[PDB]
Amino acid sequence: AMNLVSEKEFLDLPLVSVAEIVRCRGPKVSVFPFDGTRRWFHLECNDDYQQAALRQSIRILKMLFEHGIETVISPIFSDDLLDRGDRYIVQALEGMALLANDEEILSFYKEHEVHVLFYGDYKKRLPSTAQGAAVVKSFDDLTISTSSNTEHRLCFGVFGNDAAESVAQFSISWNETHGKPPTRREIIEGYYGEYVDKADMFIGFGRFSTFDFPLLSSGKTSLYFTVAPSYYMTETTLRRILYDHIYLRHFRPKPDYSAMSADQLNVLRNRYRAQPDRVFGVGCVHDGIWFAEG
Amino acid sequence: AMNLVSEKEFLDLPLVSVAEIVRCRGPKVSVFPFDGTRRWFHLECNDDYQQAALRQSIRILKMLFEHGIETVISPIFSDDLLDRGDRYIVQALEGMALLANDEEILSFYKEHEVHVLFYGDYKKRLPSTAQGAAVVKSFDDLTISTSSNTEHRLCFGVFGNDAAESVAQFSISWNETHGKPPTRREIIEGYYGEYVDKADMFIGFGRFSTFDFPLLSSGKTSLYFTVAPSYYMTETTLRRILYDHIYLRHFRPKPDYSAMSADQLNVLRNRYRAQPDRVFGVGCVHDGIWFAEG
Numbered sequence: 001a002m003n004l005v006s007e008k009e010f011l012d013l014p015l016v017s018v019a020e021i022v023r024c025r026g027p028k029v030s031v032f033p034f035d036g037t038r039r040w041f042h043l044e045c046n047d048d049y050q051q052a053a054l055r056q057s058i059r060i061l062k063m064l065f066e067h068g069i070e071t072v073i074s075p076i077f078s079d080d081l082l083d084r085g086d087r088y089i090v091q092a093l094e095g096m097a098l099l100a101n102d103e104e105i106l107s108f109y110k111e112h113e114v115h116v117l118f119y120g121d122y123k124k125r126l127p128s129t130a131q132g133a134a135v136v137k138s139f140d141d142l143t144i145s146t147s148s149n150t151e152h153r154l155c156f157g158v159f160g161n162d163a164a165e166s167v168a169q170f171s172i173s174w175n176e177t178h179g180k181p182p183t184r185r186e187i188i189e190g191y192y193g194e195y196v197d198k199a200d201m202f203i204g205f206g207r208f209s210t211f212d213f214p215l216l217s218s219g220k221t222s223l224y225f226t227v228a229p230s231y232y233m234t235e236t237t238l239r240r241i242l243y244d245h246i247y248l249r250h251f252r253p254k255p256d257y258s259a260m261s262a263d264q265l266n267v268l269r270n271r272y273r274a275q276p277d278r279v280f281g282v283g284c285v286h287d288g289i290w291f292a293e294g
Numbered sequence: 295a296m297n298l299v300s301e302k303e304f305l306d307l308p309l310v311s312v313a314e315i316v317r318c319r320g321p322k323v324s325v326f327p328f329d330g331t332r333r334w335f336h337l338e339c340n341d342d343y344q345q346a347a348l349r350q351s352i353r354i355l356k357m358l359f360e361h362g363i364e365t366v367i368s369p370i371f372s373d374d375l376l377d378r379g380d381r382y383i384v385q386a387l388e389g390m391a392l393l394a395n396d397e398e399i400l401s402f403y404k405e406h407e408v409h410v411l412f413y414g415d416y417k418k419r420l421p422s423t424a425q426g427a428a429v430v431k432s433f434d435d436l437t438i439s440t441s442s443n444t445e446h447r448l449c450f451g452v453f454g455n456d457a458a459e460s461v462a463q464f465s466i467s468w469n470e471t472h473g474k475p476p477t478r479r480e481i482i483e484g485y486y487g488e489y490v491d492k493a494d495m496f497i498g499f500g501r502f503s504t505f506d507f508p509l510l511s512s513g514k515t516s517l518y519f520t521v522a523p524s525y526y527m528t529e530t531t532l533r534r535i536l537y538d539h540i541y542l543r544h545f546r547p548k549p550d551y552s553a554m555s556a557d558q559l560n561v562l563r564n565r566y567r568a569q570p571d572r573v574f575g576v577g578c579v580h581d582g583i584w585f586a587e588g
């Protein structure tokens with residue numbers, strides 16, 4: 001049915017058709033960090049910062065969900081920020097508050113039936129200030145009020161870089177009360193607040209690297225790196241990524257290599273020896289910004 | 295001193311000089327999975343399989359360590375294999391036994407003062423057969439006999455894909471006996487058998503994906519993907535990867551972007567809008583084999 005759709009068709013299909021294919025073939029869980037906010041704004045907008053990023057974020061989340069992806073995991077704030085200015089810190093908490101209180105995004109969560117969750121070490125690492133305690137309350141509240149939404153799940157990562165200590169404490173308490181260690185499923189439910197399947201793909205940008213989706217990484221998490229920041233994500237780019245993951249990463253059926261002609265195995269040998277030192281991930285720097293070569 | 299070495303010089307330097315730079319600047323911990331064994335053999339060798347892969351593996355580990363990398367984490371066998379033939383399974387255990395008993399590699403561990411460790415769920419997942427129980431004993435034994443070696447550390451991953459349940463059980467036992475949860479450091483020591491710093495880089499090949507180094511991944515783990523399988527790794531490729539990680543991934547000093555000319559910020563804007571849909575990780579398939587485009 002959907003097994004032999006070509007990339008050309010995939011790229012031409014109506015949005016609703018792509019969604020049906022994804023809903024059926026995956027990716028079910030996609031990691032999409034929001035980063036490069038500052039440079040995107042100053043490069044593609046230069047109204048108000050926080051609002052521009054907020055709406056742009058909604059645009060992309062809307063895009064991801066309308067393409068049929070059930071769950072999106074979005075790291076948005078990592079430890080690093082506590083080591084930045086105080087004004088920079090306040091700025092962050094304001095952005096955090098937006099995701100949980102701003103009217104336009106709350107409307108978005110409702111219209112697209114999105115259940116929102118927060119993960120990470122923010123309850124411990126967020127400033128003990130009034131603003132910080134308010135953010136935590138807002139996070140807990142949004143998670144509960146949107147729990148009736150079932151179409152999509154959105155997991156925001158706030159200091160969600162290393163869950164080791166958190167898993168340890170959760171397991172100890174779980175064993176104390178239950179008498180047995182929690183299962184993997186229960187460990188995940190404890191960290192994300194709900195069970196979430198392993199990530200099927202991660203879309204980053206710039207330097208090849210992944211981060212902030214503990215417990216959900218697998219050799220099957222397809223990795224992609226766009227040249228431009230998260231906010232630049234176009235329709236075409238997303239579809240080419242979805243197509244690669246669905247149809248190309250795990251090609252079927254596979255051939256019986258022991259049954260290939262001498263020429264085939266020879267053309268293949270040449271594909272590998274062609275450019276003997278070819279490697280993706282090595283880059284060059286321009287204006288302090290790293291860009292992948294080749 | 296070593297801060298402004300150019301790539302050209304880096305590529306021309308004697309091995310011993312590169313090692314000194316790495317020993318000083320890192321990467322301290324590198325992940326290098328061994329995969330593509332079958333296709334490498336049939337493509338670049340076609341004596342005996344197991345021995346060819348064994349010696350090739352030593353060649354590469356020798357290369358990695360002689361370039362100054364202290365610790366190499368090498369996933370070598372993952373769950374998948376238990377779902378393959380029985381002959382394929384026996385073949386694996388034989389390869390496993392080699393890493394721990396074969397004379398030439400034992401000599402290698404001694405000559406380069408390498409402490410070897412094994413991580414993963416192999417104690418539980420390895421066949422309860424005689425061969426399986428023998429492999430476990432061999433693994434434990436090698437870890438102890440090489441513990442006096444201090445120059446390098448080698449961590450072999452055998453079913454080391456998801457440490458969640460293992461961390462949970464380890465934490466519960468640790469709390470029982472210690473009265474308090476283990477620290478992150480202790481959790482890592484418990485999984486790898488020794489403390490190991492976060493991975494500074496991961497070198498894979500083919501499809502962009504990472505796997506089997508639980509707890510050691512960070513946004514700072516630089517990712518690289520060669521076109522050809524692990525065994526093809528050349529001197530030039532390794533140096534270009536090392537250079538990128540050491541000097542380019544974290545460029546210093548950074549510029550004051552709010553202080554850049556209108557043209558600079560304009561050339562930059564064009565670098566991002568140039569090829570608006572550019573993305574690394576999307577590929578094409580040839581003979582059932584995926585190759586990254588662009």
Ligand SMILES: O=P(O)(O)C(O)(Cc1cccc(-c2cccc3c2oc2ccccc23)c1)P(=O)(O)O
Nearest residue numbers: 035036037038039040042043289550551552553559
């Ligand atoms: O873009 P990101 O938000 O990811 C960040 O790297 C900062 C940054 C990196 C690279 C370029 C820029 C950038 C580019 C063009 C114009 C301006 C930039 O940053 C500022 C600050 C103040 C005025 C203009 C610009 C900012 P961050 O550390 O603030 O997250």
Ligand SMILES: O=P(O)(O)C(O)(Cc1cccc(-c2cccc3c2oc2ccccc23)c1)P(=O)(O)O
Nearest residue numbers: 034035036037038050053054057076078091092095
């Ligand atoms: O500028 P970046 O988002 O790249 C980052 O500096 C984090 C940050 C620092 C200061 C302010 C914000 C911020 C402020 C207002 C709104 C939003 C912010 O970040 C996001 C992400 C997604 C949606 C809205 C906002 C983010 P980073 O740690 O992710 O590099």
Ligand SMILES: O=P(O)(O)C(O)(Cc1cccc(-c2cccc3c2oc2ccccc23)c1)P(=O)(O)O
Nearest residue numbers: 256257258259265329330331332333334336337583
């Ligand atoms: O190369 P890998 O060892 O990673 C593996 O993908 C198998 C494989 C993938 C792609 C190509 C080949 C290959 C290529 C050329 C010749 C032959 C290949 O496999 C066989 C088997 C028997 C005879 C010849 C070849 C093997 P695996 O599942 O056995 O690990």
Ligand SMILES: O=P(O)(O)C(O)(Cc1cccc(-c2cccc3c2oc2ccccc23)c1)P(=O)(O)O
Nearest residue numbers: 328329330331332344347348351370372385386389
């Ligand atoms: O052929 P691959 O090594 O790619 C793999 O099939 C695993 C495997 C299956 C069957 C036999 C072996 C094997 C047998 C003998 C020696 C060695 C083997 O794998 C390695 C890796 C590194 C050094 C020696 C050996 C490995 P994979 O699960 O890693 O894809």
Ligand SMILES: [Mg+2]
Nearest residue numbers: 035036037038
């Ligand atoms: Mg940033």
Ligand SMILES: [Mg+2]
Nearest residue numbers: 329330331332
């Ligand atoms: Mg293989």
